[PDB]
Structures are given as structure tokens and as C-alpha cells.
Amino acid sequence: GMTEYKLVVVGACGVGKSALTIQLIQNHFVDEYDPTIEDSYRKQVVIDGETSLLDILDTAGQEEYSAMRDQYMRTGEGFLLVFAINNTKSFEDIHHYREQIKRVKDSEDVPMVLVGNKSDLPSRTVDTKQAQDLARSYGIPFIETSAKTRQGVDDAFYTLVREIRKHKEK
Ligand SMILES: *CCC(=O)N1CCN(c2ncnc3c(F)c(-c4ccccc4C(F)(F)F)c(Cl)cc23)CC1
Ligand SMILES: Nc1nc2c(ncn2[C@@H]2O[C@H](COP(=O)(O)OP(=O)(O)O)[C@@H](O)[C@H]2O)c(=O)[nH]1
Ligand SMILES: [Mg+2]
Known part of the structure; x- marks a missing residue:
């Protein structure tokens, strides 16, 4: 089949993971997306002339460390580490998300992209x-x-794909 990329969007509640995911998938901004809905969306894209299938997991729900989640997260090939530019705690939380990815992947070399969301807001x-x-x-x-204006959304996900490619070349 065509090449696939398993992408995972992570970060604290309210940073815009779901809004970013829906922008990528559906090309519009969603104001309200239930914080309890964790789901994955697949979309066919062309990046640098390569047709691929992006399988994107939008993490949600609760802070809990189920076995399903660890295994689930282990299958992720690349991760968007999302914080919001108007929420300092969400930025401080990035360390946690990085370490947890490092824990489950058992690797110092995992494709990731740091995403500073809500760049439209003046309250930085x-x-x-x-x-x-x-x-x-x-x-x-x-x-x-x-996610509101769609600034940087394609770039975020496509850059993550490029990081995965870099990893696969090693
Ligand atoms: C508001 C709801 C929401 O968007 N979520 C609820 C909190 N949840 C979360 N919180 C804290 N830590 C999390 C976490 F460490 C992981 C996780 C588990 C295992 C391996 C890696 C990871 C990580 F996401 F990479 F950090 C997850 Cl999946 C969720 C966590 C998610 C967001
Ligand atoms: N102004 C602005 N609001 C956003 C942006 N992204 C998400 N939001 C809003 O922030 C809140 C949380 O977004 P959501 O996608 O549910 O975050 P999640 O908990 O990480 O999935 C919602 O009310 C969204 O409408 C953005 O880029 N700009
Ligand atoms: Mg959400």
C-alpha cells in the first residue's frame, strides 16, 4: 500500500490539539470539541511529491497511564508537542510530554515538533x-x-512527516 505516517498530537488540556487536528483533516476551525473525545483521523496528502496516508491520533480524555495508552503511544512514529502561547503552564508541561514519549519509545531519538498554538491571541x-x-x-x-486562522497548521504536520523521514534514513 501507500506510505503511512502514524502521528500523535499531545499536550495539556485546552492547548488546541483537537482544533489543530480538525483544521488538518477538515480545513475549518472548531470552537468546541469535547475534551473527552480521543480519536484518530486518516487523511491522504501529498508532501514533497510523496503521496501518503496520515493517521493522526488526537489524545484526550484524562491523565491516566493505561496499558492500552502506553502500547498505543508506542506505535506513534512522530509527535506534535503542543502548548498554547497564552498559557505558561502548558509550556512548562512540555517537559512531561517529552519525557513520557521518551519513556514509552525507549529512545532519545523520536520524531517530534514543538508547536506553539493560539498565535492569533494578543495575550502572549x-x-x-x-x-x-x-x-x-x-x-x-x-x-x-x-488553529483559529489555520496559520502554520500544514507546516506543523508536514514538518513532523519530514522529521519521520529523517529518522527513517538513519
Ligand atoms: C483535557 C483532555 C486532554 O486533552 N488530555 C487529558 C490529559 N492527557 C494527558 N495528561 C497528562 N499526561 C498525559 C500523558 F503523559 C500521555 C502519555 C502517556 C503515555 C505515553 C506518552 C504520553 C504523552 F502524551 F506523550 F505524554 C497521554 Cl497520551 C496523555 C496525557 C492527554 C490530554
Ligand atoms: N484563539 C484560538 N483559540 C483556539 C486555538 N486552538 C484552539 N482554540 C480554542 O481553545 C479551546 C481548546 O481547544 P481544543 O482544540 O479543544 O484543545 P485540546 O483540549 O488540546 O484538544 C477551544 O475553545 C478552542 O476553540 C487557536 O489557535 N486560537
Ligand atoms: Mg481535545
């Missing part, structure tokens, strides 16, 4: 430089997005 509390420095320390890209 997390400096772009701060995010850039963190991303550089992790050795990963940083992309600013707005």
Missing part, C-alpha cells in the same frame, strides 16, 4: 525565543500555529 505569556531555545535543546523544529 510564552516568548517565541523561549520556545525556540527549548526546541533547539531538544534538537527538534518549532512551529507557531493558530
Whole structure:
């Protein structure tokens, strides 16, 4: 079959994981998406001339560490680490999401992209430089997005695919 990429969107409640996912899948902004709905969406795309199937898991529900979740998360090939630029705690939480990915993958080299969402909002509390420095320390890209306007959304997911390709070449 055609190439597939298993992508996982992670980050604290309310950062815009679901809004980002629906923007990628359906090309419009959803104001309300139930925080208890965790689901995956597949979409056929062409990136750098390669046709692939993106299988995107939008994580949700509760903070719990079920066996299903670990196994589930283990199958992820790349991860979007999403915070919101107006929520400092969500940015501080990124360390947790990175470590948990590192724990379940048993690897220091997992495709990830740091995503600073809600870039449309004026009430910024997390400096772009701060995010850039963190991303550089992790050795990963940083992309600013707005699920509201769709700024950076394709770039975020497509950049993650490119990171997966880089990983697969090694
Ligand atoms: C508001 C609902 C929502 O969007 N979610 C609820 C909280 N939930 C969550 N919270 C805290 N830690 C999480 C976590 F560590 C994982 C996880 C588990 C196992 C391996 C990796 C990961 C990680 F996401 F990469 F961090 C998950 Cl799946 C969810 C966690 C998710 C968001
Ligand atoms: N202004 C703005 N609001 C957003 C953006 N992304 C998500 N939201 C809103 O923030 C809230 C949480 O979004 P949601 O997608 O449910 O976040 P999740 O809990 O990480 O899945 C919702 O009310 C969304 O409408 C964005 O880029 N800009
Ligand atoms: Mg959600």
C-alpha cells in the first residue's frame, strides 16, 4: 500500500490539539470539541511529491497511564508537542510530554515538533525565543500555529512527516 505516517498530537488540556487536528483533516476551525473525545483521523496528502496516508491520533480524555495508552503511544512514529502561547503552564508541561514519549519509545531519538498554538491571541505569556531555545535543546523544529486562522497548521504536520523521514534514513 501507500506510505503511512502514524502521528500523535499531545499536550495539556485546552492547548488546541483537537482544533489543530480538525483544521488538518477538515480545513475549518472548531470552537468546541469535547475534551473527552480521543480519536484518530486518516487523511491522504501529498508532501514533497510523496503521496501518503496520515493517521493522526488526537489524545484526550484524562491523565491516566493505561496499558492500552502506553502500547498505543508506542506505535506513534512522530509527535506534535503542543502548548498554547497564552498559557505558561502548558509550556512548562512540555517537559512531561517529552519525557513520557521518551519513556514509552525507549529512545532519545523520536520524531517530534514543538508547536506553539493560539498565535492569533494578543495575550502572549510564552516568548517565541523561549520556545525556540527549548526546541533547539531538544534538537527538534518549532512551529507557531493558530488553529483559529489555520496559520502554520500544514507546516506543523508536514514538518513532523519530514522529521519521520529523517529518522527513517538513519
Ligand atoms: C483535557 C483532555 C486532554 O486533552 N488530555 C487529558 C490529559 N492527557 C494527558 N495528561 C497528562 N499526561 C498525559 C500523558 F503523559 C500521555 C502519555 C502517556 C503515555 C505515553 C506518552 C504520553 C504523552 F502524551 F506523550 F505524554 C497521554 Cl497520551 C496523555 C496525557 C492527554 C490530554
Ligand atoms: N484563539 C484560538 N483559540 C483556539 C486555538 N486552538 C484552539 N482554540 C480554542 O481553545 C479551546 C481548546 O481547544 P481544543 O482544540 O479543544 O484543545 P485540546 O483540549 O488540546 O484538544 C477551544 O475553545 C478552542 O476553540 C487557536 O489557535 N486560537
Ligand atoms: Mg481535545
